[PDB]
Amino acid sequence: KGGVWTNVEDQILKAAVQKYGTHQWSKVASLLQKKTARQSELRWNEYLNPKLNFTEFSKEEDAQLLDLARELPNQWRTIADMMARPAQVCVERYNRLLESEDSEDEEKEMLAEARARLLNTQGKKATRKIRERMLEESKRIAELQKRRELKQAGIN
Amino acid sequence: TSHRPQLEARSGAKAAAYTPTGIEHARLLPGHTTLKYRKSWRKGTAFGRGYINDMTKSEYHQEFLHKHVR
């Protein structure tokens, strides 16, 4: 039941944080079917944040990493803040660096639901005020044309 | 909207022109009606032989959270 992340759900989550903000994760999961507010928070804070550091390893970084993993053995959330990098990437390269020593049918409907919910910002009170103001002008337009049609007959 | 901060407070200029009501409050009843005027077993072991202006960094705050969390 633990699902994998399609690129559609990846784009809905990025647009959700762009509007809702990083602390309203139950707001984000409402758009995002089949996914949890915990899972949404975990992906943005481990993968989708553009502040994160997914790039090549300079030899300064490799010497620093093998320094840190020797000085702070197996403390990866600590090391990932000293490296200013994501944590499982930091483990993935430390796994690789030591190996140097070798011897749409549904999704678009969700996306159509997400596309409309992000672009409707008012709530009950403003949409109702709109409805009452349109119905009040419609009553006004009705009563004025009544008076004009009676004025067509000459009776004022 | 509908939940707003004040741009200005309610002025007492508006209540000054109103006509009074003369309703009788319990706290305006007469009271204090008179003013007052002035005139070898220790060898085997491993090893034996002030105020900060911050409410969160205070010493009482550290003694607080150590006793009320436990």
Place this chain on the structure above:
Amino acid sequence: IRQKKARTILQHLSEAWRCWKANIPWDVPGMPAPIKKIIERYIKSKADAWVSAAHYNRERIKRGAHVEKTMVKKNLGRLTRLWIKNEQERQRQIQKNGPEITPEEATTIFSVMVEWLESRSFSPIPFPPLTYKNDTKILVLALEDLKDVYASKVRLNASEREELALIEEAYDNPHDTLNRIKKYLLTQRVFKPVDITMMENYQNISPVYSVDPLEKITDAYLDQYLWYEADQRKLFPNWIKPSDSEIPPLLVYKWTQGINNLSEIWDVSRGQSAVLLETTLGEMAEKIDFTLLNRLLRLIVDPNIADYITAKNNVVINFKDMSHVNKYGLIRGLKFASFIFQYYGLVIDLLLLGQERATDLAGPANNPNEFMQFKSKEVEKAHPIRLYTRYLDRIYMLFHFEEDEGEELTDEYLAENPDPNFENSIGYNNRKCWPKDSRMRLIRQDVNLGRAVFWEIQSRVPTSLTSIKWENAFVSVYSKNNPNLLFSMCGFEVRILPRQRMEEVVSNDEGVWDLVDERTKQRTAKAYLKVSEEEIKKFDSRIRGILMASGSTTFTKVAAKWNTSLISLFTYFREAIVATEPLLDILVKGETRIQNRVKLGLNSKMPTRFPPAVFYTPKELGGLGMI
């Protein structure tokens, strides 16, 4: 500047206060430095009111002095922000100023534990192979322990419904879920964050850690495996408690027996004296250093699992807004947190006792002792530490001195820090629940011998591991001036008189244990039992938790919550209520608040409308069935 520009600047005030509560640094790029100076001046001004109202209302809730039901939920929400803000600040002070343990300390701490396990000839626990004969039963006991949370409750959320599905997938595929656990112990080192919440107990606020369910199964399997293989290899010696072989009232009973059974303590014909010490170990699990912790575990555990344990403690702790990485402290909410917490306590037990005496207490490796036994009496007579035991973070030491050994011990204390005004009996704390005749008499010879005992013990453990303080210390000296030996085990408050130090031997009620010698089979002491004042307030807070949670609950659920809390009081403290007069007042005021809750369900508190037949007749006859 107009009504538009005044309107935008006040939103930085609101944003700064939210960053303060989240303990997020509020830094706006491009903010004018005079205006940033104004906002930080008032955020601190609001913070002084915010924190002081949290201290003021906390003191009202402990007194029970009319706190609104909403304000109890608000004060819980304020302290959990203050506790983490104090937690996150404590994390940064370790990160800036290095570890509190020096390299000289941690070399000796590691050297003590290697010296111990070499004498015990302790073989380390291996990684569990797949051809492991006990592997399917250890897996079932883990899952049944995870399942017992949910046999009670009716509703489950999306996290809990995920948790039951992962157990049922593991019941149906026992071989497949072992291969998932064995792979995570070898490979997985980055874990999902932990959501923390705080439990109100009206006297303190206890923390609760919520681990991810897929990570919870591999913790619970590991905790069953580590506790099983420790006891087969006999890791933990006899003094470490909870014992897995005795209930906490039986721990009080044997310890009170095993004092009396030991020879010549009561004999005070010479100047000889007996000292009992009680100290909490302060912030014991809070001061565990992971780099030290990973190195210590490699002595006893295959380094793959010793690497599993160290990485799991380094996760992200999440409150609502607040989030930080646990760089330093131990998380007690993990499943295997018990195995760490007692093993780290075994190191502290060797710093106090030493290598020579902890060998005498625990006995030899092939044929160890029982809980309070020695291989001979001559082994017992050497080294004045007679009995040692250690609860979670609470130690109990029994010292029997001669007159000459007592005078040397108390002289070298007065050499280091004497008092001319004889002020050692001022800060000395004893039991204010017993009478003044019955508690410790503040004799200048015994008080100074009491503080000298603690001064020897505080110096044996460095302050970088535990904070052993005199304010948390309770020392009771038995001498020729003090006939009473007083201590406090697992909620039980105990006073001991010998048979011969009593004026006359009067018969007693249920609240008094008769302590028997093993060889004479004769009752030679009496143990007077009371409930601790800390446990009386703990039970009073449970009755409030029944009432403050039940707004519009039925009458018989209130009666069922009263019964399950009254039985839990009386079946644990059985015979100890009788001597306690404050507890009997809590039972009276507590039971009538339950009855008034039914009387507030109706609109009448009138005593005639509610006879005892309404409340106390069984549920089969239509009554509430209150006990």
Place this chain on the structure above:
Amino acid sequence: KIPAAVSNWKNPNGYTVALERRVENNTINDGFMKLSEALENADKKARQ
């Protein structure tokens, strides 16, 4: 000049503001260094 207020918590008009507007510099001291080296030197002495 005051920068405009973009909050992580509140969005009253529901504005879509870019991800950089919605959301350390030190090293470890030598105490973590000398701790880990002493534990290895204590460990290598224990192995020999």
Place this chain on the structure above:
Amino acid sequence: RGGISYDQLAKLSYEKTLRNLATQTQNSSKQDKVQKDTKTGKITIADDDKLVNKLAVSLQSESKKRYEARKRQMQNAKTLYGVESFINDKNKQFNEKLSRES
């Protein structure tokens, strides 16, 4: 650099209106009192009917030019930028304000 203070901008807009008034007198060249009351303290000034019309039409025409220049600036402001996602005009308008702050 800086902005222009309201004393200088009042002066500069004063000078622009004098230059424009000067060219109106130049173009009018190329194409070709005070009585105080006795009864009251009120004062009466004789004026031509021209130059009152000319001031009123000029104030209307300057208002027309500034209205249509801002209206055409409205047209450019909602047709230039389309990179960032928005919801309404007021979104793009506020995110132009954040781009101005950078």
Place this chain on the structure above:
Amino acid sequence: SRNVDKANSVLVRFQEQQAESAGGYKDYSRYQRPRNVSKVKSIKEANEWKRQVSKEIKQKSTRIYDPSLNEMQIAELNDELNNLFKEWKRWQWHI
């Protein structure tokens, strides 16, 4: 429970039934058409019935010219205006 329930209880019905037998109440804002006109009674009685029909005319007439944008509903609204028109006449014959 909405005041639809509270208006139709036995006691509220009882005093209207007395006010029929003690005076000139009843209202007529309560009852239906009634389906037939030739079965209706005196004129002073029917004038208040007739007056009621004018009031639903005025509700419907004000509703016709609105931009409701429903061609089917305004067709329905013209039908009730036409039937109430024919209804307004049959009371006039009865008058």
Place this chain on the structure above:
Amino acid sequence: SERKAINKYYPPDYNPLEAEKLSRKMAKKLKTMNKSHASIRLMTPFSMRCLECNEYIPKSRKFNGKKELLKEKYLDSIKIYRLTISCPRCANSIAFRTDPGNSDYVMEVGGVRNYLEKRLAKIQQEQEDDEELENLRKKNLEMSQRAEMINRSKHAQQEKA
């Protein structure tokens, strides 16, 4: 006056049983009695899409709507209801059906929804998993030795310096 009222004042000439006759006869002539479509506050459990102004009724939004007892009767005897709801932007009524056999709703006018040889094989998978676990344990010991080889080389670089 009060939410709970023990006594309601009756007229001095009244009786309960004679009223029940009288009250029943009145109960045929009212406009409220003859029209019984039940008005009920409800929430839509199945996001909407309007067909006229294409408005979307979020997930589950409150409506004062109109319940109607349907002339149909699911199976030999099970009740079935039809609920109607007005749209916020436009004046349009959208209808429900409650299927008792298939627990979800179905809707209509005005709205649309958003969407021993086997035992020998078991020994083989047992053998495969143990070899994988032996390798992964071997990996971590190799990974340490690979870390030590860099650690010994860096220490040698310190000695050369």
Place this chain on the structure above:
RNA sequence: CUUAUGCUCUUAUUUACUAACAAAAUCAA
């Protein structure tokens, strides 16, 4: 215009709607 409403009694069983208020449900087999 076309144009049957109202008045008098019985036949098998307890069920629908308002929810702002409460929501650790714990626990003995």
